[PDB]
PDB file of N, CA, C and O in Angstrom:
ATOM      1  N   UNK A 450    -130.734 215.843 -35.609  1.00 13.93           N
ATOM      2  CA  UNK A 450    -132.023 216.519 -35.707  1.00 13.93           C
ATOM      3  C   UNK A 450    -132.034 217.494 -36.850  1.00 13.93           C
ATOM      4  O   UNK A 450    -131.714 217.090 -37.968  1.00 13.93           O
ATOM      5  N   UNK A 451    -132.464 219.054 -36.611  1.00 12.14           N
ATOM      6  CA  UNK A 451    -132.536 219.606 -37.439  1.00 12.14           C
ATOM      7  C   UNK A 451    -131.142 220.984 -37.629  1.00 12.14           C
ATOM      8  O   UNK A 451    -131.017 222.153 -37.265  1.00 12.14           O
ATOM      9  N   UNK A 452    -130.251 219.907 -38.464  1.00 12.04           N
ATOM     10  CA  UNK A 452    -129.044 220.386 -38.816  1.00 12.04           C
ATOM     11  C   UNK A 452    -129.219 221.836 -39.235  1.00 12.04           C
ATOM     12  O   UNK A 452    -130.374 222.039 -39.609  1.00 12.04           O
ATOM     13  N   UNK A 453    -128.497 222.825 -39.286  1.00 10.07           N
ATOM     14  CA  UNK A 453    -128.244 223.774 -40.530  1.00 10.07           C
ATOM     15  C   UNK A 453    -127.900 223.244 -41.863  1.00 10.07           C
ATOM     16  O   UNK A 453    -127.205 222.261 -42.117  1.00 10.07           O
ATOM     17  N   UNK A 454    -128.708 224.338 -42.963  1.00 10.34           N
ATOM     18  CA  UNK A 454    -129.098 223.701 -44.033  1.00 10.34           C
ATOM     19  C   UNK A 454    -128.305 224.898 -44.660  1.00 10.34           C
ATOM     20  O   UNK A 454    -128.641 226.040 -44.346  1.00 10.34           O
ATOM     21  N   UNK A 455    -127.297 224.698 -45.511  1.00  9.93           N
ATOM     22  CA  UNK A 455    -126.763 223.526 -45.778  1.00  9.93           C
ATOM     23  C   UNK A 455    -125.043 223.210 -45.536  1.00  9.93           C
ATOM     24  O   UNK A 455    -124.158 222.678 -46.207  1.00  9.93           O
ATOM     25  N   UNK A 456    -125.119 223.760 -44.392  1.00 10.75           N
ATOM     26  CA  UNK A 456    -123.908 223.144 -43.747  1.00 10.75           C
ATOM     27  C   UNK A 456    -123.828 222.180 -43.190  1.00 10.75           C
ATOM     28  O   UNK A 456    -124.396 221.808 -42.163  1.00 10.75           O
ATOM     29  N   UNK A 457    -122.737 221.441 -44.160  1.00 12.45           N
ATOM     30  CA  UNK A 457    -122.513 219.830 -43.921  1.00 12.45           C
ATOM     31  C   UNK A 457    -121.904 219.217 -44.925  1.00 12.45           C
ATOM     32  O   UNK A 457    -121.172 220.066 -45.434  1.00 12.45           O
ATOM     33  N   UNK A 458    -121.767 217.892 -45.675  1.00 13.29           N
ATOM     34  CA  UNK A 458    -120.795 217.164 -46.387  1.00 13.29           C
ATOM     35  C   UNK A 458    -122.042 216.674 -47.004  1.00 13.29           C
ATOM     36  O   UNK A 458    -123.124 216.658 -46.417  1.00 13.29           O
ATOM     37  N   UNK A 459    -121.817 216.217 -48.388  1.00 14.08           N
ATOM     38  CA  UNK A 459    -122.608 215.519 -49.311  1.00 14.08           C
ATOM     39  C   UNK A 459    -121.298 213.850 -49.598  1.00 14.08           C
ATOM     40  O   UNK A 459    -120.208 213.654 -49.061  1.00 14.08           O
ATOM     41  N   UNK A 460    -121.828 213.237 -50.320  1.00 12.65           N
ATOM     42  CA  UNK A 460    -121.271 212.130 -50.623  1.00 12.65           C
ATOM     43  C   UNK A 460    -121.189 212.213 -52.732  1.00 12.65           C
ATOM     44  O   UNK A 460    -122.086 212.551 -53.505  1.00 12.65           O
ATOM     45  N   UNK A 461    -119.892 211.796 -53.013  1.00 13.25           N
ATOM     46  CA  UNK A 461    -119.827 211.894 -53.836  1.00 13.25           C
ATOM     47  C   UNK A 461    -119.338 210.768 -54.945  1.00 13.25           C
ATOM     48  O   UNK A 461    -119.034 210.800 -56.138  1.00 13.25           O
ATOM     49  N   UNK A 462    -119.431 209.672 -53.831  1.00 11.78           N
ATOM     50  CA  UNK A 462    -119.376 207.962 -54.667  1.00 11.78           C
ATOM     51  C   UNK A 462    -118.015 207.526 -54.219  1.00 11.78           C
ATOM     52  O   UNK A 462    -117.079 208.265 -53.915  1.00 11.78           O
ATOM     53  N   UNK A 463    -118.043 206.116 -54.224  1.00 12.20           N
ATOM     54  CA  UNK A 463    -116.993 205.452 -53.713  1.00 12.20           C
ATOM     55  C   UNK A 463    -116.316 204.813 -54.695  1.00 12.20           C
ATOM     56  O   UNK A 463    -116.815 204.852 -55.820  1.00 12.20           O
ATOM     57  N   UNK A 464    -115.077 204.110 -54.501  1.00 11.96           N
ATOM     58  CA  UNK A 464    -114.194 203.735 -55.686  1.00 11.96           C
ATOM     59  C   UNK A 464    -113.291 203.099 -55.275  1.00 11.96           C
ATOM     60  O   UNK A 464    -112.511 203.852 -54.692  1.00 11.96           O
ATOM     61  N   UNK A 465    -112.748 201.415 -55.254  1.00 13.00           N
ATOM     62  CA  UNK A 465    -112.227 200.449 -55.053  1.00 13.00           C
ATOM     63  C   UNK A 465    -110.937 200.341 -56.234  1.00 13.00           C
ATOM     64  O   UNK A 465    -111.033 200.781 -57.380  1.00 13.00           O
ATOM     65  N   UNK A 466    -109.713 199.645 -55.658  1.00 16.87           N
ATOM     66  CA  UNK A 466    -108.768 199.300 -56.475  1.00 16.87           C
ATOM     67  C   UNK A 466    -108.947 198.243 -58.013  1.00 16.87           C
ATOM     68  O   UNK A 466    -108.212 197.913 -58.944  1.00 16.87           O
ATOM     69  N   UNK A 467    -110.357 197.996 -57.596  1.00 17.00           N
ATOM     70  CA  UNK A 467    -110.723 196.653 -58.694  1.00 17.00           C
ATOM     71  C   UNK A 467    -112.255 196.639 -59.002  1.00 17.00           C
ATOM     72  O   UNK A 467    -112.867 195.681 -59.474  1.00 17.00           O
ATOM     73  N   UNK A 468    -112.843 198.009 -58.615  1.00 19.89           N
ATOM     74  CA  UNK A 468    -114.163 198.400 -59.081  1.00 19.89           C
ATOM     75  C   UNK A 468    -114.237 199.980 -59.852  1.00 19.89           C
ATOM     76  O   UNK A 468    -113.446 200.915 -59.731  1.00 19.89           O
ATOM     77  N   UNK A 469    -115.185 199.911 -60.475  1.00 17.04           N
ATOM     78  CA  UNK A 469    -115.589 201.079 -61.435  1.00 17.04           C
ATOM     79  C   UNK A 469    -116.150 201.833 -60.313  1.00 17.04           C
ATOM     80  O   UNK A 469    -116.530 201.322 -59.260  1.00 17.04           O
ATOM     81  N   UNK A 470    -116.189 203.490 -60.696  1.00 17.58           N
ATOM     82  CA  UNK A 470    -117.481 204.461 -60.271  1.00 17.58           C
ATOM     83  C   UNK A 470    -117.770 205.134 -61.155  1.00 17.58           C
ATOM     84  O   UNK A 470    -117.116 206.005 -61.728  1.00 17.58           O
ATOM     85  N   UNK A 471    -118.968 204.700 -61.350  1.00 15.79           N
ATOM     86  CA  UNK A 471    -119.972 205.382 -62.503  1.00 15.79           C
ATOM     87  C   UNK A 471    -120.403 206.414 -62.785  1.00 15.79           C
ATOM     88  O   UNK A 471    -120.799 206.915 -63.838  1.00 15.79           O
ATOM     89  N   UNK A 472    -120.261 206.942 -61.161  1.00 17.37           N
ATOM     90  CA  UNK A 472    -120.709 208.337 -61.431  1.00 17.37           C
ATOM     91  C   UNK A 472    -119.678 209.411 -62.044  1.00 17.37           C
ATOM     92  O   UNK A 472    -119.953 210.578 -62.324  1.00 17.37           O
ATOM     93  N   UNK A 473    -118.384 208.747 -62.200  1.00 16.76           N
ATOM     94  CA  UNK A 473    -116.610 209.725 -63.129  1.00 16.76           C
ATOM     95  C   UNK A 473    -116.439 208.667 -63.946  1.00 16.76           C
ATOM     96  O   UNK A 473    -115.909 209.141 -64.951  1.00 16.76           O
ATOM     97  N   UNK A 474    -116.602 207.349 -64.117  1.00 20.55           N
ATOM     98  CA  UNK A 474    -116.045 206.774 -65.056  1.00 20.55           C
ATOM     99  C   UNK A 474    -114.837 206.534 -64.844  1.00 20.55           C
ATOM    100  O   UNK A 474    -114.277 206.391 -65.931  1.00 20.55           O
ATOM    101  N   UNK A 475    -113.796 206.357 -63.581  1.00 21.81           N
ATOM    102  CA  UNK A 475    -112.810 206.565 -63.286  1.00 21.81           C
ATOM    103  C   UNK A 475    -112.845 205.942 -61.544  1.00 21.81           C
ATOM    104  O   UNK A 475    -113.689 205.915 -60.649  1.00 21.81           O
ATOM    105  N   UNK A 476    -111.370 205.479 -61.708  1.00 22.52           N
ATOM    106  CA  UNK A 476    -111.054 204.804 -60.502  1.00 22.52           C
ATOM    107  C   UNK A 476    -110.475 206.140 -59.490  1.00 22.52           C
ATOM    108  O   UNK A 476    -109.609 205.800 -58.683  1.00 22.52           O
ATOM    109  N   UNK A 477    -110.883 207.619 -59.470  1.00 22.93           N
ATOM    110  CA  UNK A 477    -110.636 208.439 -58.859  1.00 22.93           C
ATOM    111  C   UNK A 477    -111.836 209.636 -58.082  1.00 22.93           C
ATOM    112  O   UNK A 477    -112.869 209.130 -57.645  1.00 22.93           O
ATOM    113  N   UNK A 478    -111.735 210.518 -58.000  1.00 26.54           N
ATOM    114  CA  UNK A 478    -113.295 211.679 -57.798  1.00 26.54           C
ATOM    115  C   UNK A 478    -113.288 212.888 -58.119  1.00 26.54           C
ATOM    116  O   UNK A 478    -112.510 213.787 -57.799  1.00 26.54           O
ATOM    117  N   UNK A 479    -114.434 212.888 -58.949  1.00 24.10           N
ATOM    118  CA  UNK A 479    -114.319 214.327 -60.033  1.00 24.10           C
ATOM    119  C   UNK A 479    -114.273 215.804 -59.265  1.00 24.10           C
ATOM    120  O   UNK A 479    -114.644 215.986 -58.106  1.00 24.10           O
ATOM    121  N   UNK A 480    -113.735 216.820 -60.163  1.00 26.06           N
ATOM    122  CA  UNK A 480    -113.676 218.115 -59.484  1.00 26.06           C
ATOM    123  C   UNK A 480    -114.312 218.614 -58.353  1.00 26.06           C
ATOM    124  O   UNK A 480    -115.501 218.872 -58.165  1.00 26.06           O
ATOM    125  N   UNK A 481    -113.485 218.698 -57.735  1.00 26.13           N
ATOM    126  CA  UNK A 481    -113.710 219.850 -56.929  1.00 26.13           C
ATOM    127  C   UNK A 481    -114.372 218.316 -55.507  1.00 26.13           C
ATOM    128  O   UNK A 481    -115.481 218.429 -54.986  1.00 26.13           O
ATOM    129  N   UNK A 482    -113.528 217.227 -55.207  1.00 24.57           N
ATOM    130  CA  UNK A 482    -114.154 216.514 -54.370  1.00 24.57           C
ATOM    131  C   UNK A 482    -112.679 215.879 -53.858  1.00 24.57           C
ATOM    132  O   UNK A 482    -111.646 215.673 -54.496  1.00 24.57           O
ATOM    133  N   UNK A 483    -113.060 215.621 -52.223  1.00 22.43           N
ATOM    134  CA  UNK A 483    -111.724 214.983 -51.656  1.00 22.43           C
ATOM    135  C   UNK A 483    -111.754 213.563 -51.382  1.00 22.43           C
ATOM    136  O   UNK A 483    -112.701 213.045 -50.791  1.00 22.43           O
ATOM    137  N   UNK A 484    -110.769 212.931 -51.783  1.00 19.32           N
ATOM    138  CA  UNK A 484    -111.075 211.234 -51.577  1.00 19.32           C
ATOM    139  C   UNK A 484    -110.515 211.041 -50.064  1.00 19.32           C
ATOM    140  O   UNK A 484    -109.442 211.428 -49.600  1.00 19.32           O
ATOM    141  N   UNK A 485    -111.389 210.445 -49.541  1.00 17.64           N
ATOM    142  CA  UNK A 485    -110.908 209.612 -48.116  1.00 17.64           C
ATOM    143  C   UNK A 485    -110.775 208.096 -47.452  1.00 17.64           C
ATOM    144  O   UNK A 485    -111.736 207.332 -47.367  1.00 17.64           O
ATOM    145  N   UNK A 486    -109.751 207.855 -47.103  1.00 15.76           N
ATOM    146  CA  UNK A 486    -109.545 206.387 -46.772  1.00 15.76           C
ATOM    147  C   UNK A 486    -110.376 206.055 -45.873  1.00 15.76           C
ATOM    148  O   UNK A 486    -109.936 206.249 -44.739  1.00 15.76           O
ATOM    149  N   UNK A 487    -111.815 205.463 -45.941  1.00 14.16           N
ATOM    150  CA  UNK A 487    -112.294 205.406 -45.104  1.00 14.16           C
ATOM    151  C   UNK A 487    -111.785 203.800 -44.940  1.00 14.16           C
ATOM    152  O   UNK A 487    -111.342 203.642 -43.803  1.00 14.16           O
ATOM    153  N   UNK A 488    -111.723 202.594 -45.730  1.00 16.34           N
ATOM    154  CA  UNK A 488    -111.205 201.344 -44.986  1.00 16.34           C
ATOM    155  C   UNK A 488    -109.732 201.000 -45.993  1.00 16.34           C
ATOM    156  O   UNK A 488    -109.102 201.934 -46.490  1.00 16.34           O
ATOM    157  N   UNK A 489    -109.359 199.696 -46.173  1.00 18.75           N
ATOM    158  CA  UNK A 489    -107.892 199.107 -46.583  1.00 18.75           C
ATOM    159  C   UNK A 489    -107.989 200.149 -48.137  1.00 18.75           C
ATOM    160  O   UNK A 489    -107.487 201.229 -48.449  1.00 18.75           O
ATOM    161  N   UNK A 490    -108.843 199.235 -48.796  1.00 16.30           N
ATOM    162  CA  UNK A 490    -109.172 199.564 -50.334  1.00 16.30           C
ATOM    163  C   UNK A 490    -110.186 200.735 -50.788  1.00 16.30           C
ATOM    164  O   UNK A 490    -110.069 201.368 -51.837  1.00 16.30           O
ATOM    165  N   UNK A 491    -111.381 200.951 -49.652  1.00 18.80           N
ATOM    166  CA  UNK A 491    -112.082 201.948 -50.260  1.00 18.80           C
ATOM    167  C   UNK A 491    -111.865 203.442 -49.923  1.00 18.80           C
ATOM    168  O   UNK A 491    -111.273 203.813 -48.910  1.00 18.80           O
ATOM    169  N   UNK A 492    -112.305 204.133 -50.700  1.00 21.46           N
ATOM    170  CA  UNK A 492    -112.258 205.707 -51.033  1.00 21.46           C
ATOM    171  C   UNK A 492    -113.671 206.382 -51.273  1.00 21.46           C
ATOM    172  O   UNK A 492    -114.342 206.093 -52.263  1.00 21.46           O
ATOM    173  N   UNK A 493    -114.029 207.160 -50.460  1.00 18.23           N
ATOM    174  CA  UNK A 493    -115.122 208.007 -50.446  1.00 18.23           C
ATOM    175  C   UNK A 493    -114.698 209.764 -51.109  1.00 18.23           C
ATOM    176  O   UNK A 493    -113.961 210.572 -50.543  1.00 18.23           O
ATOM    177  N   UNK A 494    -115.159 209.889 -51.946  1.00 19.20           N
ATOM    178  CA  UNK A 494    -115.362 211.068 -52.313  1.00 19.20           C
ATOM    179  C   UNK A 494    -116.183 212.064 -51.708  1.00 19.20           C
ATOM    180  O   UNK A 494    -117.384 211.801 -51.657  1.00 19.20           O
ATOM    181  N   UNK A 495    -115.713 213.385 -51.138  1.00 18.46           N
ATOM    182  CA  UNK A 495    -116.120 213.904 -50.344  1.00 18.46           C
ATOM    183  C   UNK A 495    -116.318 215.493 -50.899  1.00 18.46           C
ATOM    184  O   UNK A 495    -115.277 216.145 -50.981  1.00 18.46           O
ATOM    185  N   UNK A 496    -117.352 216.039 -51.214  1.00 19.25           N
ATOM    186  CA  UNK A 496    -117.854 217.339 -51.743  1.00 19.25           C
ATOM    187  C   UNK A 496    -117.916 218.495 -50.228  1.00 19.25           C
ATOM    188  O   UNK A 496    -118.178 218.063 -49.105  1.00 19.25           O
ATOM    189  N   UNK A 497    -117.623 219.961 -50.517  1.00 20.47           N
ATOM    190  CA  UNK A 497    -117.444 221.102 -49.860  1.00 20.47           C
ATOM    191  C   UNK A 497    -117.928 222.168 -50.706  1.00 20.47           C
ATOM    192  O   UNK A 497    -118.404 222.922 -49.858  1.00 20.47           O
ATOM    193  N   UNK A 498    -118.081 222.616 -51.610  1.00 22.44           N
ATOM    194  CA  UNK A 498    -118.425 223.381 -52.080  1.00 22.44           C
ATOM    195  C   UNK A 498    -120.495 222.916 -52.323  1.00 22.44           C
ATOM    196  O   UNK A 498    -120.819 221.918 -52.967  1.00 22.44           O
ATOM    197  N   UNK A 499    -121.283 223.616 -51.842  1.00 23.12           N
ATOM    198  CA  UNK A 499    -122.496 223.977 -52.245  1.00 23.12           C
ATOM    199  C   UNK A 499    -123.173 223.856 -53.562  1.00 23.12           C
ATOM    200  O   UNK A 499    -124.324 224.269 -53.704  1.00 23.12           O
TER     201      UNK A 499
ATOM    202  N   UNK B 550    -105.148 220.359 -43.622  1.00 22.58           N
ATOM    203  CA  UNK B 550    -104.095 220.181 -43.346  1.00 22.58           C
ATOM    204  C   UNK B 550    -104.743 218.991 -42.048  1.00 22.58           C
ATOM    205  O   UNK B 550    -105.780 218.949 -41.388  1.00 22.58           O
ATOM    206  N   UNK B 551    -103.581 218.178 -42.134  1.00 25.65           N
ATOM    207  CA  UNK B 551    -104.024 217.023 -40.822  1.00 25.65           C
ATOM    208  C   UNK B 551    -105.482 216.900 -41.141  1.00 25.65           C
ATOM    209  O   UNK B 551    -106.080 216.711 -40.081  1.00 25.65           O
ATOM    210  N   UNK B 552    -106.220 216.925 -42.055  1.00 23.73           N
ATOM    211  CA  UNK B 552    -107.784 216.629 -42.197  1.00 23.73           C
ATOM    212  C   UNK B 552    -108.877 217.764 -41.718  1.00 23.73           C
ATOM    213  O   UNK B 552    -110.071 217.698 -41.425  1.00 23.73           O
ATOM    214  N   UNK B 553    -108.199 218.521 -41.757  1.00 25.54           N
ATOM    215  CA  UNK B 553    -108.795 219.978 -41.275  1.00 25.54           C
ATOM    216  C   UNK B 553    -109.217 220.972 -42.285  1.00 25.54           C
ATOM    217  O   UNK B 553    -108.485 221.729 -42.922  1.00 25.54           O
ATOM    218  N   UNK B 554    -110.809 220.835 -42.352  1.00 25.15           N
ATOM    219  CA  UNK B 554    -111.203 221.507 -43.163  1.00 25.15           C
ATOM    220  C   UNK B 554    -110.651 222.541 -43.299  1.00 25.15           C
ATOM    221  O   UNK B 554    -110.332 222.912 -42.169  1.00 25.15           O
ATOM    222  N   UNK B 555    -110.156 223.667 -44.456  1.00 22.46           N
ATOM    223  CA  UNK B 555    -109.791 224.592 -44.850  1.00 22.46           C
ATOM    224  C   UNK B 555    -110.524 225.362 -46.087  1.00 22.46           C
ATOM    225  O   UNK B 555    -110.188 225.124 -47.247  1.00 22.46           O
ATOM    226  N   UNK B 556    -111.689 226.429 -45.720  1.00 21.37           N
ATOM    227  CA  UNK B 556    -112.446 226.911 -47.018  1.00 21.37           C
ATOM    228  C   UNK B 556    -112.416 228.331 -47.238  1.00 21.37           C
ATOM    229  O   UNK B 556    -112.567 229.117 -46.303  1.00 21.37           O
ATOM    230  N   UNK B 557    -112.266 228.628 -48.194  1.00 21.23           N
ATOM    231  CA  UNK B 557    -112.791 230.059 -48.337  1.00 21.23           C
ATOM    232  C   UNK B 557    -113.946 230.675 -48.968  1.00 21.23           C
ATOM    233  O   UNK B 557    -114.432 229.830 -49.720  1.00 21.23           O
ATOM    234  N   UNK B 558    -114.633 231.797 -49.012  1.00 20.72           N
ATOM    235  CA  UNK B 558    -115.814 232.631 -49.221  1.00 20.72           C
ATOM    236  C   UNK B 558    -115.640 233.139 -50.635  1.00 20.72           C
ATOM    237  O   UNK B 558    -115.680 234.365 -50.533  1.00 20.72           O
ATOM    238  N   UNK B 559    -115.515 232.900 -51.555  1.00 19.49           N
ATOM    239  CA  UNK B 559    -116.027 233.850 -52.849  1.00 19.49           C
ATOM    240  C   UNK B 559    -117.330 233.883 -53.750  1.00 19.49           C
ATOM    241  O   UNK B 559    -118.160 232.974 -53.749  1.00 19.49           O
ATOM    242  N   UNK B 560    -117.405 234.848 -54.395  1.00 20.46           N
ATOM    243  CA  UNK B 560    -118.523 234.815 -55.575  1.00 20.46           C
ATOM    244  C   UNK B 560    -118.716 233.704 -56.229  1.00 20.46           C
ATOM    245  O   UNK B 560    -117.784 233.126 -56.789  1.00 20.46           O
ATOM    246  N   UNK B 561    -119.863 233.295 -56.242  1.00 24.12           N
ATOM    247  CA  UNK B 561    -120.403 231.696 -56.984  1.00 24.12           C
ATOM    248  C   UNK B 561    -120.590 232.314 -58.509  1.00 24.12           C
ATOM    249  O   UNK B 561    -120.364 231.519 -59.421  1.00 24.12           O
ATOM    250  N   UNK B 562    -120.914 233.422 -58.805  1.00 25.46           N
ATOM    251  CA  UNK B 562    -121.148 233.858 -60.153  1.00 25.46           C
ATOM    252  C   UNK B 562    -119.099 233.952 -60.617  1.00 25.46           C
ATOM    253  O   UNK B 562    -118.857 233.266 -61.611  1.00 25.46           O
ATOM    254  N   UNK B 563    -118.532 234.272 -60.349  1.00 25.08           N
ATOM    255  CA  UNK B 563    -117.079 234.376 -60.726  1.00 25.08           C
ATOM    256  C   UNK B 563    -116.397 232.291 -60.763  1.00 25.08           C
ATOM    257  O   UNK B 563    -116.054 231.469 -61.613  1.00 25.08           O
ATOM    258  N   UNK B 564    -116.530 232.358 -59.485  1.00 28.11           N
ATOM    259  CA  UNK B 564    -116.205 230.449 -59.553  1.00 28.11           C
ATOM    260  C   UNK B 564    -117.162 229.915 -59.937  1.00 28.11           C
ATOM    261  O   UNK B 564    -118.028 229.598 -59.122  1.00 28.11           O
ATOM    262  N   UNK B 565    -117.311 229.655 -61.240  1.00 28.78           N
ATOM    263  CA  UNK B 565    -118.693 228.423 -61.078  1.00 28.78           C
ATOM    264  C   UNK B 565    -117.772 226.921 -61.590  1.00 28.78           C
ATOM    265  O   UNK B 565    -118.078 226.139 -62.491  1.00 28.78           O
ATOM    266  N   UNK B 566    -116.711 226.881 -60.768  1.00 29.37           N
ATOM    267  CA  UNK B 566    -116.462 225.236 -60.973  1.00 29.37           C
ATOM    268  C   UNK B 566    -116.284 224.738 -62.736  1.00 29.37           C
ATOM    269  O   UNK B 566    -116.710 223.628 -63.057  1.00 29.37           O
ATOM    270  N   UNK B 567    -115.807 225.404 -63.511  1.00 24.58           N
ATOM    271  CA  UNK B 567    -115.377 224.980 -65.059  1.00 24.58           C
ATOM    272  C   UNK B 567    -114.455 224.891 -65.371  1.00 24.58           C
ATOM    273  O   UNK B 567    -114.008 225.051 -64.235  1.00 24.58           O
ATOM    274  N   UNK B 568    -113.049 224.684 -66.310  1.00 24.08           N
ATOM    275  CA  UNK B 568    -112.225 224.501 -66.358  1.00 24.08           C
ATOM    276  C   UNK B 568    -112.272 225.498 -67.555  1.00 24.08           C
ATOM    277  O   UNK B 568    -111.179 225.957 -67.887  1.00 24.08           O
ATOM    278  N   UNK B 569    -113.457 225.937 -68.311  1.00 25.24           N
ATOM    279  CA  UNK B 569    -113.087 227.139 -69.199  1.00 25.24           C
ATOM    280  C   UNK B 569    -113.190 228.017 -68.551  1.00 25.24           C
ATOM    281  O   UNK B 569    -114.099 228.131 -67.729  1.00 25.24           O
ATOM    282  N   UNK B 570    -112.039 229.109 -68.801  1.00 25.83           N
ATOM    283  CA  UNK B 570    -111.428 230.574 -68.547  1.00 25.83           C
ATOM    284  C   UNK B 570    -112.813 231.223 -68.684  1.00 25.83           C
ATOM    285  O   UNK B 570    -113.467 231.153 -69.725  1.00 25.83           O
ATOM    286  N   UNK B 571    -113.248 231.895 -67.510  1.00 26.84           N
ATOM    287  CA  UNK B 571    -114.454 232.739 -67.216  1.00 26.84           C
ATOM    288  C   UNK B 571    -114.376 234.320 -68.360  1.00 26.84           C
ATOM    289  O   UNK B 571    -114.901 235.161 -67.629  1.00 26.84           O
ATOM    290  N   UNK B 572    -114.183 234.696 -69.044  1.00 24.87           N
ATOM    291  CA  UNK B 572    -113.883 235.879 -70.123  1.00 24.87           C
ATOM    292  C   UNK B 572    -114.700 236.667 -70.267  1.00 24.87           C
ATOM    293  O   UNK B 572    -115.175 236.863 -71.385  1.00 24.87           O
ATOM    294  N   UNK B 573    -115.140 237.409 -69.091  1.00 22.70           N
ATOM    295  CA  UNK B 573    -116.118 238.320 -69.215  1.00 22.70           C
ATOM    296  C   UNK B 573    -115.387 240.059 -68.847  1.00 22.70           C
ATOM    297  O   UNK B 573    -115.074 240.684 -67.834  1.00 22.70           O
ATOM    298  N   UNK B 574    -115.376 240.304 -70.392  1.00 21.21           N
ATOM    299  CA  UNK B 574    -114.526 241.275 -70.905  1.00 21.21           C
ATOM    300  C   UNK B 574    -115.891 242.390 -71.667  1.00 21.21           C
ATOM    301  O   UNK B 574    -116.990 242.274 -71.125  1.00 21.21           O
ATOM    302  N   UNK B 575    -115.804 243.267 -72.699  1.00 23.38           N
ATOM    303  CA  UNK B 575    -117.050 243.731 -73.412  1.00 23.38           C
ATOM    304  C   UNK B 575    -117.974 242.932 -73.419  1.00 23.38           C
ATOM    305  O   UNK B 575    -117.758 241.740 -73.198  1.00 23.38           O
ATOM    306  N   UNK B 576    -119.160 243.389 -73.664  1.00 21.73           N
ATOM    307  CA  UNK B 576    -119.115 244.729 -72.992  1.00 21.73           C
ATOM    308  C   UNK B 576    -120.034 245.025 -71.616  1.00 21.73           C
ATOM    309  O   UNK B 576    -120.525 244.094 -70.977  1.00 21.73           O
ATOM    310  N   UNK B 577    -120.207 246.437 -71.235  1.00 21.09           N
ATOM    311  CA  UNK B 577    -120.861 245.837 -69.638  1.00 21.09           C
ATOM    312  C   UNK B 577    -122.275 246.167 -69.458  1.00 21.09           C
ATOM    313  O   UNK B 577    -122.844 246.450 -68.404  1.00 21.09           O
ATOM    314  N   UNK B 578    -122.905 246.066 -70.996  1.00 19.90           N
ATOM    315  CA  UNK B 578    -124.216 246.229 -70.432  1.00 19.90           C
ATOM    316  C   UNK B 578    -124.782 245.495 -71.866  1.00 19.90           C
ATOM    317  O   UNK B 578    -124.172 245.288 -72.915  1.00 19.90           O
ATOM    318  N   UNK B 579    -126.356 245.151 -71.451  1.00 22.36           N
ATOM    319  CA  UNK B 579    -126.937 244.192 -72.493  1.00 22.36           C
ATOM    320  C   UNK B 579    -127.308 245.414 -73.401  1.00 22.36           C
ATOM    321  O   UNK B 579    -127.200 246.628 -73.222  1.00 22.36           O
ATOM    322  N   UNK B 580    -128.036 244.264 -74.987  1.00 21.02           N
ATOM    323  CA  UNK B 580    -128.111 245.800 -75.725  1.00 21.02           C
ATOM    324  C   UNK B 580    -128.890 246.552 -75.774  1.00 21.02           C
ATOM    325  O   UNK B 580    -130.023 246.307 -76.187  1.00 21.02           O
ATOM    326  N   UNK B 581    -128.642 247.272 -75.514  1.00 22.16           N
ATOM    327  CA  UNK B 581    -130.283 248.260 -75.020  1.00 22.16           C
ATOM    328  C   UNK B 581    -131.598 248.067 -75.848  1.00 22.16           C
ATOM    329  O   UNK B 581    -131.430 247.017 -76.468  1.00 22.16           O
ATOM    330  N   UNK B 582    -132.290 248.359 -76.017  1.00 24.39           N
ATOM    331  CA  UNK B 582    -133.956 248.310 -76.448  1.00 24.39           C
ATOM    332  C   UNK B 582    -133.795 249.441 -77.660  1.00 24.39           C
ATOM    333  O   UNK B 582    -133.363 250.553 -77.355  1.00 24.39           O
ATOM    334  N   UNK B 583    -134.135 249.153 -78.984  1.00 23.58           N
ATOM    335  CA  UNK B 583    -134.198 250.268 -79.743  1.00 23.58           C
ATOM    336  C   UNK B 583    -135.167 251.414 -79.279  1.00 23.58           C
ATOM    337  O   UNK B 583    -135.259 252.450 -79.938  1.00 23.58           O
TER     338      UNK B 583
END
């Protein structure tokens, strides 16, 4: 419903062993973002800072 | 740690997320108005 704003997680692009992310140009996730195993191969980049 | 968020509270004007050295040295006021 109506979460607190803006506490919470943003998304910051995903990134495969054998795919690009466009949004870094890089098979990794730019400053200040945490990558997470969400399945075998993929990685979600995960933002905390506002 | 174990996936446990861990954050801390500082000034957004001091961290603004750059990798250039923040250098705010002289002086501490703008220049005044003739």
């Amino acid at each position: 419903g109506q979460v607190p704003d803006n506490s919470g997680l943003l998304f910051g692009g995903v990134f495969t062993d054998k795919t690009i992310n466009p949004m870094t140009n890089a098979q990794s996730c730019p400053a200040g973002y945490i990558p997470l195993n969400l399945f075998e191969s993929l990685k979600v980049c995960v933002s905390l800072d506002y | 740690s174990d996936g446990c968020q861990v954050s801390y509270c500082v000034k957004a004007g001091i961290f603004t997320g750059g990798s250039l050295l923040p250098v705010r040295l002289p002086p501490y006021t703008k220049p005044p108005l003739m």
